[PDB]
C-alpha cells in the first residue's frame, strides 16, 4: 500500500598535499513515500420492467459513460490540488533546510489579488520571476508545463506584447494555448482548479 523513493546528496572536495591520504567526506540521503488507502465508486440500478419499457435508447452505456467522465474529472481535480499544495508548502520559509545538502526548494510567488486582475503585465512579470528563480537553482526549463485557470489564462493573453505582431514575443492562434516566448515554455489552460468555501466538505480521499 506504499511506494518509496530515495534522494542522494553532495560530495565535498578538498586540497591534497603530496604523499598523504586525505580524509573522506560523508554523503547524506533521505526518502519520500506515498500511501494509498481509499477507493471511490459510483453505482446505479435499473429495474427489468422499467428497462423493457423505456423511451430512452441505450440508457445503460450512457450512464456508464457519464460515470466514467465523473471519475475522470475527480482524479484531475485531486492531482491539481495536490501539486498546488506541494508548491506552497515547501518554500524556503517553512522547510528552511533541504532534504539533502544538495537539492533546492520549491518557489512560491505571492502577489496582491486586485492588481493581478487589473493588469496582465503584473502576471507576466510574476511568471517570469518564478521561471528565472527556477533557472537559478539548476533546473532545466526545456520541459515545463504551465497551468492557469481560464480567468487568468485570459488575463495573461491580453498583454500588448503577445497580441501585437511587431513585438518578438507574439503568437497567432492563442485560444487553444500558446507558447510563452521569453522562455520557450508552453501554456495550457485547465478548467479544473481547486476552489474554497467556508463550509468544510471534507474531500472523500482525505482520511484521519
Amino acid at each position: 500500500n506504499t511506494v518509496s523513493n530515495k534522494y542522494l546528496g553532495e560530495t565535498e572536495i578538498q586540497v591534497l598535499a603530496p604523499g598523504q591520504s586525505p580524509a573522506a567526506t560523508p554523503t547524506k540521503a533521505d526518502k519520500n513515500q506515498v500511501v494509498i488507502d481509499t477507493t471511490v465508486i459510483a453505482r446505479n440500478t435499473v429495474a427489468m420492467l422499467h428497462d423493457v419499457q423505456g423511451d430512452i435508447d441505450s440508457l445503460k452505456p450512457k450512464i456508464a459513460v457519464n460515470q466514467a467522465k465523473q471519475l475522470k474529472r475527480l482524479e484531475d481535480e485531486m492531482v491539481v490540488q495536490q501539486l498546488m499544495l506541494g508548491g506552497i508548502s515547501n518554500t524556503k520559509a517553512q522547510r528552511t533546510n533541504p532534504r539533502v545538502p544538495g537539492h533546492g526548494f520549491s518557489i512560491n510567488v505571492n502577489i496582491t489579488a486586485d492588481t493581478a486582475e487589473t493588469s496582465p503585465q503584473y502576471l507576466a512579470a510574476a511568471i517570469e520571476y518564478a521561471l528565472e528563480q527556477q533557472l537559478e537553482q539548476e533546473v532545466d526549463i526545456s520541459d515545463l508545463v504551465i497551468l492557469m485557470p481560464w480567468k487568468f489564462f485570459n488575463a495573461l493573453r491580453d498583454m500588448d506584447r503577445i497580441v501585437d505582431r511587431s513585438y518578438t514575443l507574439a503568437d497567432e492562434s492563442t485560444v487553444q494555448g500558446f507558447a510563452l516566448k521569453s522562455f520557450n515554455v508552453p501554456v495550457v489552460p485547465s478548467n479544473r482548479f481547486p476552489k474554497f468555501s467556508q463550509g468544510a466538505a471534507h474531500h472523500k480521499l482525505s482520511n484521519a
Binding site: 494509498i36 485531486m78 508548491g87 520549491s106 510567488v109 489579488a113 512579470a125 537553482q137
Partner: protein
Amino acid sequence: AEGAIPDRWEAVSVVTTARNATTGDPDGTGADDTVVTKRANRKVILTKAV
C-alpha cells in the same frame, strides 16, 4: 483508487494571490509584491516628456 504526494521540490513552482486566512475573499497586500512591480515596470515603452 488512487493517491498522490509532492516530491522533487525543485520541479514544482506556484504563483498564488494573497488571501485572507479565515475567508477566501482577498484582503492581503501580498508578500512577494515589491520583488514584483519592479519586474513589471521593465516591460514598458519609455518616453521623455518635453
